[PDB]
Structure 1
Amino acid sequence: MIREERLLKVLRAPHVSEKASTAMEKSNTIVLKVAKDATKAEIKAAVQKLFEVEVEVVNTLVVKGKVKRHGQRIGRRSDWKKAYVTLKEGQNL
């Protein structure tokens, strides 16, 4: 399980949006950009031990990149896994 350094490389960056702002008040769910594999045990243990908050349920989805055309050559964006973390009752920042 821990392996504390494994849980430190799952969380990439917090994600800000108009959906996460409404989900924080209506559903009390924080949206976090996580790694490529990102199993449900690692996300719940990562928010459970790193953010020190009681995680109720975890959802995941894969964000497919787009094709950016800037010049002659084609381009692509990095894929990232959107994670939904819903807590028991308490909220945080």
Structure 2
Amino acid sequence: MIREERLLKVLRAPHVSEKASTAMEKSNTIVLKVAKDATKAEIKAAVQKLFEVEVEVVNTLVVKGKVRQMTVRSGGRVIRTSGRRSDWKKAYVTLKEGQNL
């Protein structure tokens, strides 16, 4: 069985978008950001425990980060820097009949 500390780790944030809002209002589906190494069983247990709702099924995907470019000044001189935003995991959690936040 999954320990409670793991469950308190795996849930990162609710994900806000019009796709997420439409999913909630159509299919009773909750979209979250989760830890990149969280399995579907872990997400199911975490939602069922920390949110006190009953979960039907979890769908997950990994989002690759984009390249972001911005400048940093280093000793009276602006230099252009480039780097990639970190990947993250998105969970589509379908609720049986409960209401969430």
Is the shorter-chain TM-score for this pair beyond 0.5, marking a shared fold?
A: yes
Q: Secondary structure at the match of 1:12?
A: strand
- 1:71 to partner: Cα distance: 15
Tell me the equivalent position of 1:61.
Answer: 61
Cα separation, partners in 2 of 1:57 and 1:76, compared to 1, 3 Å = same
Consecutive unaligned residues of structure 1, counting only runs of 5 or more, are: none
Question: 1:33-77 CA deviation, whole Å, 9 max, x = no partner?
Answer: 00011111100000001101000010000000111199999x110
Q: Which has the larger radius of gyration?
A: 2
* TM-score w.r.t. length of structure 2: 0.83
Q: 1:90 aligns with which of 92, 98, 101?
A: 98
Alignment partners' CA distance in 2, 1:59 and 1:24: 14
Tell me the equivalent position of 1:50.
Answer: 50
Tell me the equivalent position of 2:89.
Answer: 81
Question: What percent identity do the matched residue pairs reach?
Answer: 97
Cα separation, partners in 2 of 1:72 and 1:87, compared to 1, 3 Å = farther
Consecutive unaligned residues of structure 2, counting only runs of 5 or more, are: 78-82
Q: State how many pairs are aligned.
A: 92
Give the structure with the larger strand fraction: 2
